[PDB]
Design an enzyme around this catalytic site. Structure first.
Site, PDB file in Angstrom:
ATOM      1  CG  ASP A  92      -1.947   1.022   1.149  1.00 59.32           C
ATOM      2  OD1 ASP A  92      -1.825   2.214   0.196  1.00 59.32           O
ATOM      3  OD2 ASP A  92      -2.895   0.888   1.982  1.00 59.32           O
ATOM      4  CD  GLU A  95      -2.848  10.585  -2.317  1.00 57.46           C
ATOM      5  OE1 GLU A  95      -2.905  10.472  -3.709  1.00 57.46           O
ATOM      6  OE2 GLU A  95      -2.507  11.651  -1.713  1.00 57.46           O
ATOM      7  N   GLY A  96      -4.804   4.629  -2.081  1.00 58.37           N
ATOM      8  CA  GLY A  96      -5.388   3.383  -2.759  1.00 58.37           C
ATOM      9  C   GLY A  96      -4.457   2.891  -3.965  1.00 58.37           C
ATOM     10  CE1 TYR A 178      19.242  24.779 -28.771  1.00 53.44           C
ATOM     11  CE2 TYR A 178      19.271  26.804 -27.947  1.00 53.44           C
ATOM     12  CZ  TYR A 178      19.296  25.467 -27.617  1.00 53.44           C
ATOM     13  OH  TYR A 178      19.047  24.742 -26.460  1.00 53.44           O
ATOM     14  CB  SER A 191      19.410  21.247 -16.152  1.00 53.83           C
ATOM     15  OG  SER A 191      20.674  21.514 -16.291  1.00 53.83           O
ATOM     16  N   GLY A 192      19.827  19.691 -19.128  1.00 55.70           N
ATOM     17  CA  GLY A 192      20.482  19.543 -20.559  1.00 55.70           C
ATOM     18  C   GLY A 192      21.936  19.878 -20.659  1.00 55.70           C
ATOM     19  CG  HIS A 196      28.318  19.151 -27.005  1.00 53.25           C
ATOM     20  ND1 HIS A 196      28.577  19.547 -28.212  1.00 53.25           N
ATOM     21  CD2 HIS A 196      27.731  20.076 -26.235  1.00 53.25           C
ATOM     22  CE1 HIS A 196      28.216  21.081 -27.910  1.00 53.25           C
ATOM     23  NE2 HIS A 196      27.692  21.285 -26.889  1.00 53.25           N
ATOM     24  CB  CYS A 214      26.977  22.409 -23.572  1.00 54.10           C
ATOM     25  SG  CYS A 214      25.326  21.731 -23.553  1.00 54.10           S
ATOM     26  CG  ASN A 216      31.059  24.225 -26.857  1.00 53.27           C
ATOM     27  OD1 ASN A 216      31.007  25.184 -27.475  1.00 53.27           O
ATOM     28  ND2 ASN A 216      29.973  23.566 -26.353  1.00 53.27           N
TER      29      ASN A 216
HETATM   30  C1  LIG Z   1      24.533  23.302 -24.247  1.00 48.65           C
HETATM   31  O1  LIG Z   1      24.538  24.358 -24.117  1.00 48.65           O
HETATM   32  C2  LIG Z   1      22.971  22.468 -24.134  1.00 48.65           C
HETATM   33  C3  LIG Z   1      21.937  23.632 -23.702  1.00 48.65           C
HETATM   34  N1  LIG Z   1      21.792  24.770 -24.339  1.00 48.65           N
HETATM   35  C4  LIG Z   1      20.983  25.551 -23.424  1.00 48.65           C
HETATM   36  C5  LIG Z   1      20.505  27.052 -23.785  1.00 48.65           C
HETATM   37  O2  LIG Z   1      20.542  27.176 -25.104  1.00 48.65           O
HETATM   38  O3  LIG Z   1      19.999  28.001 -22.932  1.00 48.65           O
HETATM   39  C6  LIG Z   1      20.808  24.927 -22.226  1.00 48.65           C
HETATM   40  S1  LIG Z   1      19.099  24.582 -21.404  1.00 48.65           S
HETATM   41  C7  LIG Z   1      19.109  24.834 -19.940  1.00 48.65           C
HETATM   42  C8  LIG Z   1      17.504  24.837 -19.436  1.00 48.65           C
HETATM   43  N2  LIG Z   1      17.561  25.540 -18.153  1.00 48.65           N
HETATM   44  C9  LIG Z   1      18.506  26.868 -18.737  1.00 48.65           C
HETATM   45  C10 LIG Z   1      17.903  27.858 -19.410  1.00 48.65           C
HETATM   46  O4  LIG Z   1      17.929  29.132 -19.207  1.00 48.65           O
HETATM   47  N3  LIG Z   1      17.020  27.684 -20.676  1.00 48.65           N
HETATM   48  C11 LIG Z   1      16.405  28.711 -21.527  1.00 48.65           C
HETATM   49  C12 LIG Z   1      17.140  29.735 -22.120  1.00 48.65           C
HETATM   50  C13 LIG Z   1      16.496  30.701 -22.713  1.00 48.65           C
HETATM   51  C14 LIG Z   1      15.103  30.735 -22.993  1.00 48.65           C
HETATM   52  C15 LIG Z   1      14.381  29.766 -22.273  1.00 48.65           C
HETATM   53  C16 LIG Z   1      12.784  29.790 -22.324  1.00 48.65           C
HETATM   54  O5  LIG Z   1      12.272  31.011 -22.585  1.00 48.65           O
HETATM   55  O6  LIG Z   1      12.314  28.729 -22.146  1.00 48.65           O
HETATM   56  C17 LIG Z   1      15.047  28.650 -21.473  1.00 48.65           C
HETATM   57  C18 LIG Z   1      19.473  26.388 -19.494  1.00 48.65           C
HETATM   58  C19 LIG Z   1      21.874  23.825 -22.110  1.00 48.65           C
HETATM   59  C20 LIG Z   1      22.871  24.095 -21.537  1.00 48.65           C
HETATM   60  C21 LIG Z   1      22.439  21.936 -25.569  1.00 48.65           C
HETATM   61  C22 LIG Z   1      21.320  21.464 -25.578  1.00 48.65           C
HETATM   62  O7  LIG Z   1      22.636  23.014 -26.533  1.00 48.65           O
END
Ligand SMILES: *C(=O)[C@@H]([C@@H]1N=C(C(=O)O)[C@@H](S[C@@H]2CN[C@H](C(=O)Nc3cccc(C(=O)O)c3)C2)[C@@H]1C)[C@@H](C)O
Length: 267
Positions: A92, A95-96, A178, A191-192, A196, A214, A216
């Site tokens: 359990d 909440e069921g 992008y 968070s991303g 790379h 990121c 780079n």
């Molecule tokens: C490497 O850099 C990697 C991505 N590139 C990102 C970017 O372009 O900002 C970040 S995403 C990550 C998510 N939370 C923050 C953020 O501020 N995102 C964000 C930026 C501008 C606008 C918005 C919105 O309005 O939604 C959100 C950073 C990550 C390092 C690859 C995926 O390029």
């Protein structure tokens, strides 16, 4: 085995990481994620038995209402064997909501692999069991979009991946959108953040930060990283102008102080 009656609208299944039989790095937490939100976290914790050899103290901490993590205070000792028994069948969970099945996983810890990205030198240095094996120039996040400091756990790796603004709400044909092809991408935050290949920043690597966050590196160094780092290895970022990676990111577990982690957030 005692049978439990059930309904598809009151069952939740646990999903365990890492995979059964996997060898993972010294930063890998045990992760149990349910396909439903868990109301009674204490009941879930009492149904999960983690045993280690050599034995080490560890504890549960919930990242959100769906996923609990278990780890020791310090990085795992290489060679440690870990057994995970998620004995949730018929439990359990509040909440069921009832546990749909048991799951069992076994895994082992491989070599200690810690890569330090030092913003003062713009060098990413990979140490294996304490020995430097690789030094890579890097370009990290610009001051307006810095790379957070802290301990990152390596996750999935991709030979090729598309970074696409639509996923963060920004159309590709926006001033800030992008659609980017990326080779040899190793994920280090939910968070991303990735390590790379970035041919477009090779002149800045080792010198100036130009990324959105990121790490780079050169095409060859990114391929090297893809080949030599595994799930659960560690990337530590130091000396950037960012803050600290959030502890509940998904791969930021080690940034939560031990006294808070061990105290837990169930009961
Ligand atoms: C490497 O850099 C990697 C991505 N590139 C990102 C970017 O372009 O900002 C970040 S995403 C990550 C998510 N939370 C923050 C953020 O501020 N995102 C964000 C930026 C501008 C606008 C918005 C919105 O309005 O939604 C959100 C950073 C990550 C390092 C690859 C995926 O390029």
């Amino acid at each position: 085995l005692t049978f439990q009656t059930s309904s598809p609208a009151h069952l939740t299944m646990p999903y365990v990481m890492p995979g059964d039989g996997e060898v993972v790095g010294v930063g890998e937490p045990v992760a149990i994620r349910f396909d439903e939100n868990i109301a009674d976290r204490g009941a879930a914790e009492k149904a999960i038995k983690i045993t280690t050899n050599p034995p080490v103290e560890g504890a549960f901490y919930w990242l959100n209402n769906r996923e609990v993590r278990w780890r020791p205070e310090h990085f795992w000792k290489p060679g440690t064997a870990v057994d995970v028994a998620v004995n949730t069948y018929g439990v359990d969970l509040g909440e069921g909501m009832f546990g749909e099945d048991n799951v069992q996983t076994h895994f082992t810890i491989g070599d200690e692999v810690i890569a330090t990205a030092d913003d003062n030198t713009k060098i990413l240095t990979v140490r294996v069991n304490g020995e430097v094996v690789k030094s890579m120039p890097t370009s990290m996040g610009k001051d307006s979009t810095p790379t957070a400091n802290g301990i990152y756990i390596v996750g999935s790796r991709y030979k090729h991946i598309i970074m696409d603004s639509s996923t963060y709400g920004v159309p590709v044909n926006s001033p800030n959108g992008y659609r980017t092809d990326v080779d040899w991408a190793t994920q280090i935050s939910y968070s991303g953040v990735f390590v790379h290949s970035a041919p477009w920043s090779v002149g800045a690597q080792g010198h100036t930060n130009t990324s959105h966050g990121c790490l780079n590196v050169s095409p060859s160094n990114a391929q090297w990283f893809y080949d030599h780092v595994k799930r659960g290895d560690i990337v530590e970022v130091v000396n950037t102008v960012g803050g600290t990676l959030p502890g509940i990111d998904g791969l930021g577990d080690w940034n939560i102080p031990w006294d808070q982690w061990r105290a837990g957030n169930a009961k």
